[PDB]
Amino acid sequence: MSLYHKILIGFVLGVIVGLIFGDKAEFIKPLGDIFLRLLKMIVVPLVFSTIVTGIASMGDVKKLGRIGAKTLIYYMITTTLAVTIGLILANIFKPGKGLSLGEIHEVAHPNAPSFTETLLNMIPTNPFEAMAEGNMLQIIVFAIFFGIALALMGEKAEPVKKFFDSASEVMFKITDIVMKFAPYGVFALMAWTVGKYGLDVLAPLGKLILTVYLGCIIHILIVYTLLLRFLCKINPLRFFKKIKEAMLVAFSTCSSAATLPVTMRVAEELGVPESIASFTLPLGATINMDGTALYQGVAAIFVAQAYGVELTLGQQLTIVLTAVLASIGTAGVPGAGLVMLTMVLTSVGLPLEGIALIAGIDRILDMARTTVNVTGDLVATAIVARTENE
Numbered sequence: 001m002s003l004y005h006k007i008l009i010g011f012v013l014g015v016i017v018g019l020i021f022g023d024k025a026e027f028i029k030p031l032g033d034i035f036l037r038l039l040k041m042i043v044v045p046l047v048f049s050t051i052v053t054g055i056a057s058m059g060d061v062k063k064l065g066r067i068g069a070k071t072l073i074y075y076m077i078t079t080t081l082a083v084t085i086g087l088i089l090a091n092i093f094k095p096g097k098g099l100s101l102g103e104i105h106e107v108a109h110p111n112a113p114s115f116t117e118t119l120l121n122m123i124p125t126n127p128f129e130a131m132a133e134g135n136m137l138q139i140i141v142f143a144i145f146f147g148i149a150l151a152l153m154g155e156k157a158e159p160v161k162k163f164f165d166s167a168s169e170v171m172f173k174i175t176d177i178v179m180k181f182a183p184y185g186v187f188a189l190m191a192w193t194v195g196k197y198g199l200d201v202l203a204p205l206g207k208l209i210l211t212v213y214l215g216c217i218i219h220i221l222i223v224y225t226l227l228l229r230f231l232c233k234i235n236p237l238r239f240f241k242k243i244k245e246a247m248l249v250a251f252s253t254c255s256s257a258a259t260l261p262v263t264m265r266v267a268e269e270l271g272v273p274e275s276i277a278s279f280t281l282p283l284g285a286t287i288n289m290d291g292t293a294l295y296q297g298v299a300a301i302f303v304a305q306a307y308g309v310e311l312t313l314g315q316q317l318t319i320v321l322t323a324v325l326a327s328i329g330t331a332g333v334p335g336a337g338l339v340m341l342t343m344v345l346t347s348v349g350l351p352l353e354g355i356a357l358i359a360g361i362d363r364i365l366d367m368a369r370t371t372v373n374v375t376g377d378l379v380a381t382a383i384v385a386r387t388e389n390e
C-alpha cells in the first residue's frame, strides 16, 4: 500500500499489458502524457523557489562558494569518467561490428555555436523571458543571484524570503498531489513503450542495447557505489533503497527535468540538509548527465564501427571532451541525448547517417541514461553533504 509499491505494481502490470497487446498498447499512451505534463508543470516554479529559499536560509555566501565549486568539479569528474567507461565498453564489445548500412550521402551540418556563445547564453537578458521559455540554466543563474541577494540583504528581505519559502512548500504539496496519479501514469508509459518496441526492432541492435545497459550498470556499481561505500562511509544498499522512487520514476519517464520534483522530494528523506540539496539538485539536473555522456560515447563508437572507421587515440579523447560538453548542454527532455549526438559525431567527422540507426530504439537507451542521470544528482548531493558537516 506504500506509494512506491503502487508505482512498482503499475510498472509491472504496464510491462505485462504491453507484452500482451503489443502494437495496440498505444491506445493508452495519452494517459502517460498527462502524467508527464503534470510533472513538467511543477519544475520551473519549484526550481526557482527551492533555490532561492535554500540559498537564503543558509545565510552564508562564503559557504555557498565551497559547495558550488565542489559540486561543479565533482560533476565534471563523474561525467568524464562516464564517457571514458562508455568508450572502454564500446571498444571491448564492438557493438557496431558486423553491420554496415547506407552510404555517406552528404556532409554533416556545420556552424554549431561556439563554446563562448553557450556560456554567454546562461545569463538571461530578461528573467521573465527565461521563465516563459523554460530555459533551465538561465532560471538557475537568476535564482542564484536572487538567493545571494536575499542572503545578504538582511532584515528588509523578510517578505520575499518568507513568500518564496512558503511557495516552495506549496510546490512540494502540489507534487505530492500529482504523485497520487503516478502509478497509472507509469503503467501507461510502460504499456506504450513495451507494446511499441517489439522484439524484431531490438534484435538487430541487441548488442548496442546490452552495451548501453551494461555501461549504466557498471557506472552505478563502480562509480556511485564506491563513492558511497569507500568515501562517504554510507551503506549503498540503504542509499539505493531510499532513492528507489526517483530511480524508477526517471526510468519510466525518461525526463530528468520532469523527474526533478520526485528527486527533490526524495532528497529530503535522504538525510542531507535541505540547504545543500536545494542548490545542488537543480544544477545537476541539467549539468550532471553522466548517463548521457556514457550513452553518447557508446553511440559514437558504434557509429564509427558501423562504417569501418577506426579512431586514433586523439579522436577518442576528442570524443571525451565533446561528449562532456554535449552532456553539459543537453536539456532534460526525452530524446535530447540523441539530438546532441550530432555535436559529438561532427567533431570526429563520423557520418551523421548513423543517427538514423539509433533513432528507432532510442527510447530504450533513454530510459537507462536518464536513470543514471537522476541517480548522479542524488549521489552528488550525498557526497557534498558528507564533505561538509552533514
Ligand SMILES: N[C@@H](CC(=O)O)C(=O)O
Binding pocket: 254, 255, 256, 257, 289, 291, 292, 295, 330, 331, 332, 333, 334, 335, 336, 337, 338, 366, 369, 370, 373
Ligand atoms: N532523456 C535524458 C537526456 C538524454 O537523452 O540523454 C534526460 O532527460 O536526462
